[PDB]
Design a protein around this ligand. Structure first.
Ligand SMILES: NC(=O)c1ccc[n+]([C@@H]2O[C@H](COP(=O)([O-])OP(=O)(O)OC[C@H]3O[C@@H](n4cnc5c(N)ncnc54)[C@H](OP(=O)(O)O)[C@@H]3O)[C@@H](O)[C@H]2O)c1
Ligand SMILES: NC(=O)c1ccc[n+]([C@@H]2O[C@H](COP(=O)([O-])OP(=O)(O)OC[C@H]3O[C@@H](n4cnc5c(N)ncnc54)[C@H](OP(=O)(O)O)[C@@H]3O)[C@@H](O)[C@H]2O)c1
Ligand SMILES: NC(=O)c1ccc[n+]([C@@H]2O[C@H](COP(=O)([O-])OP(=O)(O)OC[C@H]3O[C@@H](n4cnc5c(N)ncnc54)[C@H](OP(=O)(O)O)[C@@H]3O)[C@@H](O)[C@H]2O)c1
Ligand SMILES: NC(=O)c1ccc[n+]([C@@H]2O[C@H](COP(=O)([O-])OP(=O)(O)OC[C@H]3O[C@@H](n4cnc5c(N)ncnc54)[C@H](OP(=O)(O)O)[C@@H]3O)[C@@H](O)[C@H]2O)c1
Ligand SMILES: CC(C)n1c(-c2ccc(OC(F)(F)F)cc2)nnc1C1(c2ccc(F)cc2)CC1
Ligand SMILES: CC(C)n1c(-c2ccc(OC(F)(F)F)cc2)nnc1C1(c2ccc(F)cc2)CC1
Ligand SMILES: CC(C)n1c(-c2ccc(OC(F)(F)F)cc2)nnc1C1(c2ccc(F)cc2)CC1
Ligand SMILES: CC(C)n1c(-c2ccc(OC(F)(F)F)cc2)nnc1C1(c2ccc(F)cc2)CC1
Lengths: 253, 257, 264, 264
């Protein structure tokens, strides 16, 4: 779009946010709440989710519902979309944000962490996406994929994490192109985040604030942007872009 | 850093070397080369018939030793054991050349989670099991790991999303450890190879542009692996190859580090 | 700070404008496009004969006005006096287009230092002199300066050392002041035009896949019209994509903070 | 193509090296280093008094030989005689270090066309004259030309427009002669040095209170330059900030030159 962002773009939209119990996903739920969308939030914490929702109503959500689950269950994820699109009567925006817990750790031989990472952080995203597609095609809707610097560049202590984040990129970019000719009109937004000041991130480890981070993710999705960047450093963000890649893609088109 | 000297076919003398996806296409030609350098190879794949026909031609091209195992890298259990049996069969390891990948066709993605899944299993996880399983031998031998990849593992392209994802995943993975090794003084070479269109039998079947030949490619893979190079590009197009590098990134990494 | 909406031929109507080396090639074309949009126009070059034709034909196409002043930009006194006189004739200036260059052939460089100096004098120095003479009137109309350059003014190419040197100089000097005008809040914009091969009798008589001079010109004009920092034009979308330098914009705007200009 | 293999100080022992603007800053430091390595040296600049101190220290320090010849590079005759004289004093030449610049100061540009002419004369054209005069010797020793430039000679920057024009000017000129040497098969390396703020007296004098970036150490600066020369590299990047030094090279350019290279 040629636009500038304004809060009202979300008013009355039917939004899904995953990994919505804490951290950025919640912040996003709240932002959407403030902007009066319909929101369905998911994560494992039944009792925390209910509270996020109540808060969403007080903020002025078109409506807010929760479905508790774990994205390790591919079945749960197919059915979550089904159910969620029932509570809202459709879907404008799918925000894929959840991750499985990991640690800063040297990879010796922790294979089961790699596999899990790949299922939670990447496969569930494909599944949610697949289930969310006919309705997003309905609303000429949007898919938002939360990633990180570590999905663009190498870092140590997070091989499993990066593998999966790098994977989102490969798969959704390629999918983006696909839609960019089947003239399927769903946007796909890949968010690349630097350190954000989330409880989990801070207790695991300069940090950018989560509140503004969430909104920047929502802005990028509403503006149908291809990629969103966000980091405590401006130095950081300018650089994350990759010109050499754009040319190559267009060259090979 | 890529051990500073121009290539030499001798580097591959008595070097104990596995090649996966070594039954046909590029995988085969990588083996052949290694043989004509007097290295001990162990090739794997499925078709044991065609794999027999591969070990043979190896020896009579001067391979120190050439054995084979036949299995499916869908089988993580299998792969883990293939690396032991192989290390027992050669009494060591200097080069691990992961190169196999499941079968895919050119297609719009739309519904096939099965495929996305199979691909992440055989293209990516398998490679991570072999590696883990090869780590002790490689640690003693101060050797090399080579991961084959593609243009589609660096840039976006339609019709092959399952694929690109698996390949994008390797980079993210192996570059991540590469650096872990660096801050562990761990002495293992990690080499990722970016290959544009290569003329292989199976690859050419379902593309019906510019085809770079299998020969120089496998050669190229090895050079890089021995040469201890971080990555190795190779497309039929010089024009592309130097921007298909990614200076943008080399910075930030080295920057944050 | 480029524009906030796209280009209409009417933006030049009754705009006062100078075109240099407008006695042929891209220059002559810029002039025609301009008359054809009803701008006032002063064109210059050494040859009075040919300039006469440019001027007449220019009236034929709807030029608010059209006149010339013949001279060599080898002469800074001319350069200086030429702008005043053209400024007087029109009652102002909205856009300056620096486009002339000295004659040049393809040769390996050996010892001809005279050619290097003249290249710098005519291609680069004069442009500066003209800018100096024109800025007061340009400040007045918030107009634009357009500097016509070449790929060989961003990348290295044999057979054109002197030529290339001067074009490099142009980018160097004018990019610097552009940023300079930025923070002294001068509202004159500067557009630098990076051109591949264009099919001008001279270019062609000299030298590969020429883009048409006719279009080049309009774009040049459009570029300056739309107050863009750079215009690229070449008969190869491919090249025009390889032309930009992201790194450079990056560190320009990184180091964009290492200074305060208040002693001024 | 830089010499595949790594630098050793002895690469310079016995080598006949001219260094210009070698009475202060980087230039002095270059003389010194070369002195340590046992090189023959001929420095030059305007103030002979200070040039004498340098010549002393180089001799004490171990030069195989060391002179100065004083003079202003405003005078092309001199620049040209110099080389002849320096060649005379060493029986040939292996490396030419082009380094001097005219005194200049952080200022907005206004109407100082002279400053702009002097800069092109001193920081650019003299380099060319000196080079022309050396080529014939350098040819004989398969020697090297070393040109000292700035980041202001790769990216725009305000307050240094005349300076910047002339440094840009060097890039376009020496980068095009560089190619020319490849094709004509001339074997003299040409090394362009792209520096950030170096901690020289003058420099520090000049940017203090107006600019606040990190100055790199002039001693190390000096040696990077010689190795770059000795290794026959095309560019030497040197800044305190290893960020900077990394995104400074332009690969689009290397590409574009390559395209239009082997495909004329
Ligand atoms: N924080 C940063 O510095 C940073 C940097 C770059 C990228 N990111 C991206 O930001 C996103 C979340 O960031 P964050 O830092 O805010 O993380 P976070 O606060 O810890 O929250 C992750 C969310 O996922 C839910 N979750 C965890 N395991 C799950 C599972 N198995 N199934 C379903 N839901 C699960 C968690 O809730 P439950 O435990 O209740 O299930 C939580 O709501 C991630 O995609 C991450 O990659 C963050
Ligand atoms: N060809 C190209 O243009 C191209 C381009 C970019 C990247 N690459 C990379 O080049 C590498 C080799 O590609 P290629 O074109 O040479 O492929 P190929 O000729 O079709 O060979 C695939 C190999 O993998 C083996 N394989 C197939 N399924 C397997 C399984 N389930 N478990 C274990 N091994 C299996 C095959 O042997 P069996 O079927 O008998 O088991 C065969 O040896 C691939 O990693 C690809 O990523 C190729
Ligand atoms: N055409 C290309 O392939 C190409 C490529 C890249 C950049 N460009 C740029 O585009 C611009 C125009 O090029 P062009 O091809 O149109 O050139 P052109 O047709 O030969 O025009 C040169 C103009 O400058 C004038 N001129 C020559 N010497 C002069 C002097 N000493 N003092 C004042 N004016 C003088 C000429 O008229 P008189 O001789 O009668 O005075 C003529 O009008 C130049 O800046 C060039 O660098 C062109
Ligand atoms: N230092 C930095 O922050 C920095 C940054 C980027 C690039 N550079 C480049 O590094 C090189 C050396 O810089 P620097 O900082 O060392 O400067 P500097 O200390 O001021 O060196 C100037 C030298 O040039 C000589 N010189 C001045 N005018 C001359 C003239 N008209 N004719 C002949 N020689 C003349 C000076 O001696 P006399 O006056 O007695 O002749 C002195 O030897 C320059 O090319 C500069 O562009 C420096
Ligand atoms: C390490 C952390 C800051 N990070 C990042 C991240 C990775 C690399 C970064 O810098 C660079 F890319 F340059 F390495 C910056 C942020 N992405 N997700 C994360 C999080 C994380 C990842 C893994 C982990 F074990 C603990 C936390 C989610 C916080
Ligand atoms: C599609 C093909 C050319 N390709 C590629 C590839 C190379 C360059 C490409 O261009 C671009 F750079 F844009 F990605 C795209 C894909 N990488 N592996 C492949 C192969 C392939 C992958 C998937 C498939 F279904 C059929 C073939 C392995 C031959
Ligand atoms: C040499 C010619 C092609 N050229 C160019 C030019 C443009 C792009 C070029 O390619 C590359 F990008 F590689 F520099 C090379 C030269 N710019 N002005 C010119 C002209 C020219 C300059 C010098 C000369 F001797 C003869 C003609 C002005 C016509
Ligand atoms: C301005 C200064 C830092 N500088 C530079 C320079 C280096 C990096 C710069 O940063 C960037 F280019 F990125 F803006 C800018 C200018 N190059 N030569 C210089 C010097 C200089 C040039 C001109 C002047 F007026 C005063 C000092 C020789 C010291």
């Amino acid at each position: 779009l040629n636009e500038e962002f304004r809060p009202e773009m979300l008013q009355g939209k039917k939004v899904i946010v995953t990994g919505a119990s804490k951290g950025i996903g919640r912040e996003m739920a709240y932002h959407l709440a403030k902007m009066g969308a319909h929101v369905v939030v998911t994560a494992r914490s039944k009792e925390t989710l209910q509270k996020v929702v109540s808060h969403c109503l007080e903020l002025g959500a078109a409506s807010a519902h929760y479905i508790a689950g774990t994205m390790e269950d591919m079945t749960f994820a197919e059915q979550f979309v089904a159910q969620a699109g029932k509570l809202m009567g459709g879907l404008d925006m799918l925000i894929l944000n959840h991750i499985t817990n990991t640690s800063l750790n040297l990879f010796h031989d922790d294979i089961h962490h790699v596999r899990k990472s790949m299922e939670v952080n990447f496969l569930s995203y494909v599944v949610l996406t697949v289930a969310a597609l006919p309705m997003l095609k309905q609303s000429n809707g949007s898919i938002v994929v939360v990633s990180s610097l570590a999905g663009k560049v190498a870092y140590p202590m997070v091989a499993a994490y990066s593998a999966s984040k790098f994977a989102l990129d490969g798969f959704f970019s390629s999918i983006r192109k696909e839609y960019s000719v089947s003239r399927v009109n769903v946007s796909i937004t890949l968010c690349v985040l630097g350190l954000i000041d989330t409880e989990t991130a801070m207790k695991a480890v300069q940090a950018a604030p989560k509140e503004e981070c969430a909104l920047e993710i929502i802005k990028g999705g509403a503006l149908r942007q291809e990629e969103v960047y966000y980091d405590s450093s401006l130095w950081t963000t300018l650089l994350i872009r990759n010109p050499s890649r754009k040319i190559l893609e267009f060259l090979y088109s």
